[PDB]
Paper text:
K-Ras is the most commonly mutated oncogene in human cancer. However, covalent inhibition of G12D, the most frequent K-Ras mutation particularly prevalent in pancreatic ductal adenocarcinoma, has remained elusive due to the lack of aspartate-targeting chemistry. In this Article, we report an electrophile that alkylates the mutant aspartate in K-Ras-G12D in both GDP- and GTP-bound states, blocks effector interactions and inhibits the growth of K-Ras-G12D-driven cell lines.
(RS)-G12Di-1 reacted rapidly with K-Ras-G12D•GDP with a half-life of 99 s (95% confidence interval 83–118 s) and fully modified K-Ras-G12D•GDP in less than 15 min. The covalent modification of Asp12 by (RS)-G12Di-1 stabilized both K-Ras-G12D•GDP and K-Ras-G12D•GppNHp toward thermal denaturation (ΔTm = +10.3 °C and +2.5 °C, respectively). We observed (RS)-G12Di-1 in the S-IIP pocket adopting a conformation similar to that seen for K-Ras-G12C inhibitors, with clear electron density for the covalent ester bond between Asp12 and the compound as well as the free carboxyl group resulting from the ring opening. This high-resolution structure also allowed us to assign the stereochemistry of the adduct as S at the β-carbon. To distinguish between these two possibilities, we prepared pure R and S enantiomers of a structural analog. Monitoring the reaction rate with K-Ras-G12D•GDP showed that the R enantiomer (R)-G12Di-2 (2) was significantly more reactive toward K-Ras-G12D•GDP. Furthermore, we observed the same R » S Cα-enantioselectivity (that is, C2 in malolactone system) in the context of K-Ras-G12D labeling across a panel of strain-release electrophiles such as epoxides and aziridines that can only react via an SN2 mechanism. Such enantioselectivity favoring a direct SN2 ring-opening mechanism aligns with literature observations with β-lactones.
Residue numbers in the entry: 0 to 169
Write the structure that this text describes.
């Protein structure tokens, strides 16, 4: 069989959510992608030998808190918390996005992976150990990625699928 996974990519504007998503869907780097458009994208892959359909919601748009948007976000089975390693403010915002996921999911156990993107850039301001400590505080995996080179991209999405699998087994 194939298993479908609804993944949601969240994080501050400009961190590479769309670039990561399009790397997964299309296997190359799209540097200027519709900064204002929120869409979902589907891709069949194979993860640990299991055919997997990834349905990826690339978030964007206005900050809105409503019953309708909560219920749409609630359909995510797992979430990528993305910041950029040259952008300390995006790192500081991670806690807010995690907070919102727990609320709409109404569970302390939501599959999540912390993603530090833009690892190809030399101007690093977020130390890998600091991001690891944040991930430890949440009990989730941390993966460094470059949507530009594709390093870490499959690991980030596939690790999230493995976290969802753990959750579904309960
Ligand atoms: C900006 C587009 C542009 O103008 O260039 C854009 O696409 N954004 C911005 C950040 C991400 C994306 C969507 N909006 C947004 N911003 C959030 O936080 C922004 C800050 C900064 C000002 C105050 N605000 C609090 C600290 C950070 N947060 C969210 C947000 F939480 C959601 C959302 C809403 C309801 C439920 C949710 C459940 C799970 C996850 C998310 C997410 C993400 C939820 N939607 C947008 C958002 C501005
Ligand atoms: N060097 C580098 N640039 C990136 C990377 N990911 C995204 N970008 C650039 O960062 C900017 C924002 O990317 P985007 O995908 O729109 O982020 P989003 O707002 O979170 O959807 C764009 O100019 C991208 O070309 C990366 O891994 N490396
Ligand atoms: Mg985008």
């Amino acid at each position: 069989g194939m298993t479908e996974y609804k993944l949601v990519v969240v994080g501050a504007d400009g961190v590479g959510k769309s670039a990561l998503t399009i790397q997964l869907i299309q296997n190359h780097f799209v540097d200027e992608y519709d900064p204002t458009i929120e869409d979902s994208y589907r891709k069949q892959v194979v993860i640990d030998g299991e055919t997997s359909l990834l349905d990826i919601l690339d978030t964007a748009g206005q900050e809105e808190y409503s019953a309708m948007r909560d219920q749409y976000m609630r359909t995510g089975e797992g979430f990528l918390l993305v910041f950029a390693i040259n952008n300390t403010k995006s790192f500081e915002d991670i806690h807010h996005y995690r907070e919102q996921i727990k609320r709409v999911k109404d569970s302390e156990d939501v599959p999540m992976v912390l993603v530090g993107n833009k690892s190809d850039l030399p101007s690093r301001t977020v130390d890998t150990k600091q991001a690891q400590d944040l991930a430890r505080s949440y009990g989730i995996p941390f993966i460094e990625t470059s949507a530009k080179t594709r390093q870490g991209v499959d690991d980030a999405f596939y690790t999230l699928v493995r976290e969802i699998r753990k959750h579904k087994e309960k």
